[PDB]
Amino acid sequence: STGSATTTPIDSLDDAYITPVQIGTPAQTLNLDFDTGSSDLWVFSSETTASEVDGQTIYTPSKSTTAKLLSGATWSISYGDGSSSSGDVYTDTVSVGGLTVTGQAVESAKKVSSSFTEDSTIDGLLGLAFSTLNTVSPTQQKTFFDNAKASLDSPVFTADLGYHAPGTYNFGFIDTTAYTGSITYTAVSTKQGFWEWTSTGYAVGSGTFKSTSIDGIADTGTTLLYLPATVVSAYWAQVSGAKSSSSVGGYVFPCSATLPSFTFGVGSARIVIPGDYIDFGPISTGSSSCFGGIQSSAGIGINIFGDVALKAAFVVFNGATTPTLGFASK
């Protein structure tokens, strides 16, 4: 089997991407944030504290003839941006782009933090990291991908995120029309539960490539590119007037600037992130100070190849017995 679904930016900055997902019988369609950095499929629901729901579409398990309470199971998760959610668990039928999994754990939120409430466009998350990170207790649950894998034509999914445009998540096949040149594959460590890999270096604009190993994670649920402070300083030094602002919470730059590209290495191959992709717009409405799309990972403990990086590539998440990542230009 295979599946193919369009993923759409939630706003004009590509702050996140949402993908429609069918849950239950009859189908209830929710728009979920596909997150290769976590491993829980959770949704706003009829159980979510009413004051914490503001415009989201909810899953109502009592209206699904295939929903079953997973008795005794609870979940609770916190994300790198400080947001969080928790609740109980149902199993139900879940379909993405025509690919159906029966008995998928659907984690129903009883509580969500303010940043979830405030984002009316995101109805929940669909985790695509390794199932070892799943938070359900006392019986850990599998991701949608793990549950689907054995049935797929090939044990893979691909992320093809758009810049200020829709893109595609495919399951079970590689669309050879969706990229240019060849796909370069690179080793993955699953030791931390992430799609963790090592970039071979970087370049800023038309500058020379610096060969240096940068360990990090391919994370579709993180907006920006978070890299070591040395790398990030080298980038922003090429933008007149750019500076790190402790008050804003990262590098800012004059909105009048033209940003240089940023290249990252995948083995001997190179992925080029156009300068425009690194512009996250005014820090507040009407400001001439703009927020940068490349930020330091120093506070975080891990480097993160978030959407800024991934959207410049066609990315293969190969879930074969020994997982690997693939990157192609597009």
Ligand SMILES: CN(C)c1ccc(C(=O)O)cn1
């Ligand atoms: C809607 N918000 C608060 C989100 C969504 C997704 C993530 C994440 O995948 O890490 C974090 N915050």
